[PDB]
């Protein structure tokens, strides 16, 4: 029973403890962002990485530290070392580059950020489970915006209904 890092999505100095399940986009929507109002130079912070997990869709991405990754015994830890290398190489480059380059870099980061956001949006629902929860919710097989059909995933119906009820209505139309 272990989790595997699929991809490092982002990196920040965040409030200590703002990691794990409370940082998913749906936890934040429901309960507020654990990193809200964090100001780097007035409160203790830590390096945190946004993780896309193998076998979990992008809505389940979480912020993690090197420490939490190790404590949870996740697989794919070689990707951390690679990420830290690329990051240090990128930061060296930024320090000298002409703002003409910095501009192009920033543009590619913004386009990338926008792409990543799409991955967390249900484009349409493809199928629903026969089994339903006590509360009557089936699970839903979801096609994600900007991802191919191979990246569809089963999702908790109660969770999907909080934000994508229109997709549900459309599927049952």
């Amino acid at each position: 029973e272990f989790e595997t890092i699929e991809r490092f999505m982002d990196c920040r100095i965040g409030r200590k403890g703002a990691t794990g399940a409370t940082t998913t986009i749906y936890a934040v929507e429901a309960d507020g962002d654990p990193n809200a109002g964090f100001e780097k130079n007035k409160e203790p912070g830590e390096i945190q990485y946004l993780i896309k997990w193998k076998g979990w869709s992008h809505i389940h991405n979480t912020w993690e530290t090197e420490e939490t990754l190790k404590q949870q015994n996740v697989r794919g830890m070689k990707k951390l070392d690679n990420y830290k290398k690329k990051d240090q190489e990128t930061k060296r480059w930024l320090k000298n580059a002409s703002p003409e380059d910095v501009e192009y870099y920033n543009c590619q980061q913004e386009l990338t950020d926008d792409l990543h956001k799409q991955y967390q949006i249900v484009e349409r629902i493809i199928a629903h489970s026969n089994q339903k929860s006590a509360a009557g919710y089936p699970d839903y097989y979801c096609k994600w915006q900007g991802l191919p059909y191979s990246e569809c995933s089963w999702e908790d119906g109660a969770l999907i209904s909080k934000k994508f009820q229109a997709c549900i209505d459309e599927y049952f139309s």
Partner: peptide, 12 residues
């Protein structure tokens, strides 16, 4: 002991 086998989860 025979090893036996929903696909939907959430981060808890």
């Amino acid at each position: 002991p025979k090893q036996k086998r929903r696909t939907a989860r959430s981060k808890v």
